[PDB]
Amino acid sequence: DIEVQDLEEFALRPAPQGITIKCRITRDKGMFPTYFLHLDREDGKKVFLLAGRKRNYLISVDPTGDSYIGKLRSNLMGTKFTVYDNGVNPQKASSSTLESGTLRQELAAVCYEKGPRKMSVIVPGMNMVHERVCIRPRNEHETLLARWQNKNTESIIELQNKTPVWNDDTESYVLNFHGRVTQASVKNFQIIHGNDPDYIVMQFGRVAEDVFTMDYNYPLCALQAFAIALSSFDSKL
């Protein structure tokens, strides 16, 4: 019965050891769609966790604008995404902030590149106590996408979508969601680490017109996973 008291603290809290946090994203109720993330208690009740809405998507723990704990930035193309916390943008930072207290953190970055298409998820590395090693870029070469491209693999973690395999009976590339043949698309995917395709860090799939299921494990927290999933709504595909 994973505890959820402080919504902001929960949002930023990495998934525990051998525990999978299972959630459900529900879409809505010009003006942009509002996605709601709820914890799927295994006893039957839902616990609100986060609300995300395009305006860049602002992710907040307050459903009832511009107050947020997370922010999702996309490129013009919809192929490069970066998730920030609610800290100070280094470009607008004052001398006092820059070298005395601190700037905005980068919680995640996503890149949607014959075979099945690739999806790259870059997150902050974890320390020896298994807690995110805060990445607060003071410039362009310190971001998650820049480190990823420059191969500064030290404090980061390179994840990717699990490769779906062609199924002869379905005549479609498929993924296996808990044993069930699932049609691979930008709406149904799993995030793993190349070196270990058996460990599902994140599993996202649609279960209705406006309903999807999202499960996540270590090192991810609800804010990263939720933001990764929103990037799939906003992507080129």
Pick 46 or 73: Cβ nearer ligand IBS: 73
With CB under 6 A as the contact rule, the residue among 7, 88, 146, 186 that binds ligand IBS is 88
Residues in Cβ contact with 195 at an 8 Å cutoff, skipping those fewer than 6 apart: none
Report, in Å, the least distance between residue 224 CB and ligand IBS: 16
Report, in Å, the least distance between residue 28 CB and ligand IBS: 20
Q: Does 91 bind ligand IBS (CB under 6 A)?
A: yes
Report, in Å, the least distance between residue 25 CB and ligand IBS: 19
For residue 141, give both structure tokens: 């070469």
Breaks (C-N over 2.5 A) in the chain follow: 29, 55, 64, 113
Q: Is 225 helix (H, G, I), strand (E, B) or coil?
A: helix
Check: CB of residue 93 under 8 Å from CB of residue 115. no
Binding mask 22-61 for ligand IBS (x = CB under 6 A): ----------------------------------x-x---
Residues in Cβ contact with 9 at an 8 Å cutoff, skipping those fewer than 6 apart: none
Task: Pick the piece of the chain touching ligand IBS (CB under 6 A) from 38-46, 87-95, 133-141, 153-161.
Answer: 87-95
d(CA 237, CA 228): 14
Report, in Å, the least distance between residue 90 CB and ligand IBS: 8
Number of alpha carbons in the 13 Å side-chain half-sphere of residue 227: 34
Which residues sit at the interface with ligand IBS, rule CB under 6 A?
56, 58, 66, 71, 73, 84, 88-89, 91-92
